[PDB]
UniProtKB/Swiss-Prot annotation:
It comes from Bos taurus (Bovine). Residues 4-333 form the Transferrin-like domain. It is found in: Secreted; Cytoplasmic granule. Disulfide bonds join C7-C39, C17-C30, C64-C339, C84-C306, C116-C191, C140-C334, C150-C164, C161-C174, C232-C246, C284-C289. The gene is LTF. This is Lactotransferrin. Hydrogencarbonate 2 binds at T118, R122, A124, G125. Monomer. Found in a complex with LTF, CLU, EPPIN and SEMG1. Found in a complex with MPO and LTF; interacts directly with CP, allows Fe(3+) incorporation into LTF and activation of CP ferroxidase activity. Fe(3+) 2 binds at D54, Y92, Y185, H254. Glycans are attached at N27, N135, N204. Transferrins are iron binding transport proteins which can bind two Fe(3+) ions in association with the binding of an anion, usually bicarbonate. Poly-N-acetyllactosaminic carbohydrate moiety seems to be needed for TLR4 activation. Belongs to the transferrin family.
Amino acid sequence: YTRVVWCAVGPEEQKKCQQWSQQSGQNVTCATASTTDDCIVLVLKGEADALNLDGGYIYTAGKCGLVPVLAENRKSSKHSSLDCVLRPTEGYLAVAVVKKANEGLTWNSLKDKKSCHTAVDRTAGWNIPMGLIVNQTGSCAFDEFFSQSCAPGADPKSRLCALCAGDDQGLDKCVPNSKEKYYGYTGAFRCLAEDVGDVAFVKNDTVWENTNGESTADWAKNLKREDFRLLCLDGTRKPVTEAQSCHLAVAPNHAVVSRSDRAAHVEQVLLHQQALFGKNGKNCPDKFCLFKSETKNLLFNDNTECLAKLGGRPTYEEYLGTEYVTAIANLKKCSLEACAF
Ligand SMILES: *[C@@H]1O[C@H](CO)[C@@H](O[C@@H]2O[C@H](CO)[C@@H](O)[C@H](O)[C@H]2NC(C)=O)[C@H](O)[C@H]1NC(C)=O
Ligand SMILES: *[C@@H]1O[C@H](CO)[C@@H](O[C@@H]2O[C@H](CO)[C@@H](O)[C@H](O)[C@H]2NC(C)=O)[C@H](O)[C@H]1NC(C)=O
Ligand SMILES: *[C@@H]1O[C@H](CO)[C@@H](O)[C@H](O)[C@H]1NC(C)=O
Ligand SMILES: O=C(O)c1cccnc1
Ligand SMILES: [Fe+3]
Ligand SMILES: [Zn+2]
Ligand SMILES: [Zn+2]
């Protein structure tokens, strides 16, 4: 009733969800699925209520009638006066990252190189870079641009999955969930940090969070920021300190979605859950922290300060913006208005 069913994607989000379920005294329970698309289907069936999504899936969900409820809000130096829950969202920077030692690699010489993407259909990892590449080449053959890639969610037998590693045992190669070693923001950056790929399409925050001792994870321990470079659209290469002038786009924040008819209820519960397990929540450091999972971004990104109210009660189109929606529509015509399920 005043109980919310959260949809976890894959085994590790299920485990985190179970812990949250427990700490909340079953005010939140869990449903699990193998992909984000399957979780979207559970919400449409009404077998789950909500999940936090990247812009690209918000577009998929919105076509099926799901609505944005609350958005991830990370720290800012502006609007700082305002409380986090009421502060507008800023969006994140979609960037292309390479190793400095890979000299002479620029945006213009990416053809036939190796790439690392968060997952097919995601904003920074797929939609922005591939929409840009389709536009620039006048061709929908994006499956042929890079020699090899790790792009979770593509055909395991295709070259877009050739660089993906699967789990500890080699199983689940290219699945779009955290079982795949190179999945998500962190996995895609690891793919580049390990020299599996020549380039990684992540967001600006990911580089900072997994370099200069910020991570402590074995593959990221010795990663230094000066050993990386951002690729700008003008054919240039800049330090990772210069993302405000060298990004592929600014992305709408990840946001919680639910069926429109369940939105008010999901919103109410979430604001209380975060009062309890949020950044300075009553129980977070001590019993459980919703926005922590050791650099793994499970359920929510680890850099989330809070989930923010939206204001202007936006539809999913208003939320994503006409810029981003037209870019997705244009790219999606390579792979006609309806819910994809
Ligand atoms: C790819 O090219 C298309 C087509 O020019 C670009 O998309 C359009 O986007 C602008 C800005 O939103 C709109 O004014 C046009 O209406 C859109 N054109 C079409 C065909 O819909 C698209 O933005 C470019 N993609 C990228 C990543 O820059
Ligand atoms: C890109 O990401 C990094 C990490 O989120 C941002 O760097 C932080 O900048 C904020 C100020 O906006 C500081 O409070 C943090 O201490 C910085 N993080 C670290 C670990 O150094 C950076 O601002 C972002 N760059 C751009 C252009 O948005
Ligand atoms: C569960 O929900 C009820 C009603 O809002 C509230 O009184 C209680 O504090 C919540 N318990 C937890 C642990 O979230
Ligand atoms: O359509 C919108 O709401 C929009 C478009 C571009 C930038 N910001 C918002
Ligand atoms: Fe994202
Ligand atoms: Zn810009
Ligand atoms: Zn509106």
